[PDB]
Amino acid sequence: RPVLRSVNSREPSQVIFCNRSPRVVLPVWLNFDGEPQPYPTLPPGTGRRIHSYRGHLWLFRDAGTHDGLLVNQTELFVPSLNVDGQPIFANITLPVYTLKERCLQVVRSLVKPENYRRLDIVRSLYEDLEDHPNVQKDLERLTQERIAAA
Amino acid sequence: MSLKPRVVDFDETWNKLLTTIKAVVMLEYVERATWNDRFSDIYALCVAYPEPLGERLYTETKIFLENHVRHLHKRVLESEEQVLVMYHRYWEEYSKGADYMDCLYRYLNTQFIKKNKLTEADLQYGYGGVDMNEPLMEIGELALDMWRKLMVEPLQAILIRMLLREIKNDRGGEDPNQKVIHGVINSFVHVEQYKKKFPLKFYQEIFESPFLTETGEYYKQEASNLLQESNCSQYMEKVLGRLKDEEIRCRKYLHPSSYTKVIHECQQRMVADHLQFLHAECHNIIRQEKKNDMANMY
Amino acid sequence: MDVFLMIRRHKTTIFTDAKESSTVFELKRIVEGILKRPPDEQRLYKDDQLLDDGKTLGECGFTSQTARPQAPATVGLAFRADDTFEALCIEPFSSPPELPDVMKA
Amino acid sequence: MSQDFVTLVSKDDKEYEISRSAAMISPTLKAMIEGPFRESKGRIELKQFDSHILEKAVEYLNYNLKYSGVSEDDDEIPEFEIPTEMSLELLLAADYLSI
Fold first, then answer.
1. E-strand stretches of C1-105
2. Chain B residues with CB inside 8 Å of D36's CB?
3. Cβ of A114 under 8 Å from any chain B Cβ?
4. For residue D40, which residues of chain B lie inside 8 Å, CB to CB?
5. Which domains does chain D have, with CATH numbers?
6. Pick from B269, B270, B285, B279: which is nearest to B236 by CA?
């Protein structure tokens, strides 16, 4: 890690990620290099045991909307599993996909990027519906949560 | 765009906006007709589909608000404290005017400022005052940022002196209505920038320096007077009651940290400058018990 | 249960959060929460479902997912003196417009 | 007892009555009822947007209320589908609603 540092408390812990939404759990940690570390994907309804690593930015990126996602009611996940490994359940909130969020999602699924500019919405409604979430989004959110600050 | 024109829907919106806001710049009773006027105004502002229409909307809003506040600065050129509390009322109704603008602008708050603009990026359309006349932020904010030193510079040159004098007139004479002093300097300091980064920035700048000054001035001056000609046993009690009453006036107008600090400060100023008196009449009342100097000393 | 409805009094769409376990009273408040016209003195039914005051929005046929969130349901309008049925208005939202160019293709 | 309901209205006065509890989720409703309160007194007449569109836009607000009451993300909360046809106009309704 650079002069900018990352998770020091690191170790495999008894965990079981409980993907409890219709979307994939891509477990990721913003590593020492400020870079995403992916982990085995939990398909929809995938309870998979993990040697989960405490303090980590365990963002679980969905394959359905890939949004800012709340495992266990929060963007960040951490073990970390003990001698046996309860939740920890990485219980996956499929969020209650709101009106604007669900519009973003359907505009993701249906209209093309070439047709984002051709979208059947205002020039501003383009940005209102052309947003795309990223793994580095939850990476940076959990990095801020690692210190976070006021 | 598809539903209607997406840049010149601004036209009707600014028509309705100017109409109503001029009805509600520091005046007056906000008639319903204009209420539905702004209902349809933010109607057309929401369906106006603004790339510039929002930045230009609150552009023209800032422009008219600057114009009306310069017109009101044209009205601060009037008499003494008559127009001082006239201008008290000026912002009294003009903060209300910007407020019901903002009630006309509340749904418009949801519409054309809060998504992706000056409201989220202050380094794009201009800094946080209002803007460089392409602003995207709230409207009482506009009134404050255009009203602050209309209050500060021209008016407070004499209004602060009037304040000091009539506050001193707690001893005889009087301030305005004992919150109207408080209300006036709250109007003044309320442009502690509308986020209210400080409570003292404009508080300091506006009154707190003459505030602290004449606090100490009158305090230790009357301390000298009552030391001279009050039978210092009664110097004690006179200074005490006087300080309490003036601190009451410091509850008439009040910055709950300023006047506490400085009032008690300059009371100590009064009372800490009479030295050998202390032990001398101390051991006196120790022997010749006198619960003026007993009570006041203790 | 939080039924999700529109009490259309002459097209008066009222996207509300009423209560299933609550009686026909909530069918409104609220209209009777504001106007205080009793549930049996209003034929705000679930498609002409006779709503006695002993009935609830559950017994109104509505649920939080019958009178559901993702499309709050319709409440007919027939305000009666006591029970003299008024012309009850069952009004859908409308037929929505068509596909953007995609839609899918 | 602040109404307990606000009225989002479509086209030729097709009034959707939205419970206060949902209404408050829109800061825009909360502003409108307080700002031009002589006019928008728990009334938002988008007398041009169509009922079937407005219905979905307000149903989102209800859905949000349900989701919130649920708290734990999903207790039989369905997928908030939005057909392409809706999106076109629903964008404007959604913008006016401005959660």
1. 4-7, 15-17, 73-75
2. 20, 34-39, 42, 100, 103-104, 106-107
3. no
4. 35, 39, 107
5. 1-99 (3.30.710.10)
6. B270
Does the beta carbon of C100 lie under 8 angstroms from any beta carbon of chain A? yes
C-alpha torsion sign, points B70, B71, B76, B78: positive
Across-strand partners of A13? A52
**Which of C8, C17, C98 lies closest to C47, judged by CA?**
C8
Kindly state the greatest CA–CA separation across chain D. 40
Sign of CA dihedral B154, B159, B161, B162: positive
Please, how many CA atoms are within 13 Å of residue B204, restricted to the half-sphere of its CB? Answer: 5
Task: State which amino acid sits at residue B45.
Answer: L
Three-class SS state of D87: helix
- Reference C45, options C85, C15, C95; nearest CA is C85
Q: What are phi and psi of C15, to 5 degrees?
A: -75, 100
> The tokens of D22 are what?
């949902």
CB B115 within 8 A of CB B49: no
Resolution in A: 8.4
Structure tokens at A65: 């909307």
Report the distance separating Cα D1 and Cα B214, nearest Å. Answer: 50
Q: D33-50 burial string, b = 16+ CB within 10 Å, else e? A: bbbbbbbbbbbbbbeebb
Q: How far is CA B105 from CA A62, B58, B156, D97, in A?
A: 39, 10, 31, 14
Q: Which residues of D touch A125 (CB under 8 A)?
A: 91-92, 95
C-beta separation of B56 from D59 below 8 A: no
Instruction: Return d(Cα B213, Cα B226) in angstroms, integer.
Output: 20
Q: How many CA atoms lie within 13 A of C27 on its CB side?
A: 38
Residue D80 burial (CB count, 10 A): 22
Which chain C residue has its CA at the smallest distance from A99's CA? C70
Using what technique was this structure determined?
cryo-EM
B287 is written with which tokens?
């022997």
Secondary structure class of B233 (helix, strand, coil): helix
Say whether B31 and D38 touch across the interface (CB within 8 A): yes
Do residues B3 and B47 lie in contact, with contact meaning Cβ atoms separated by under 8 Å?
A: yes
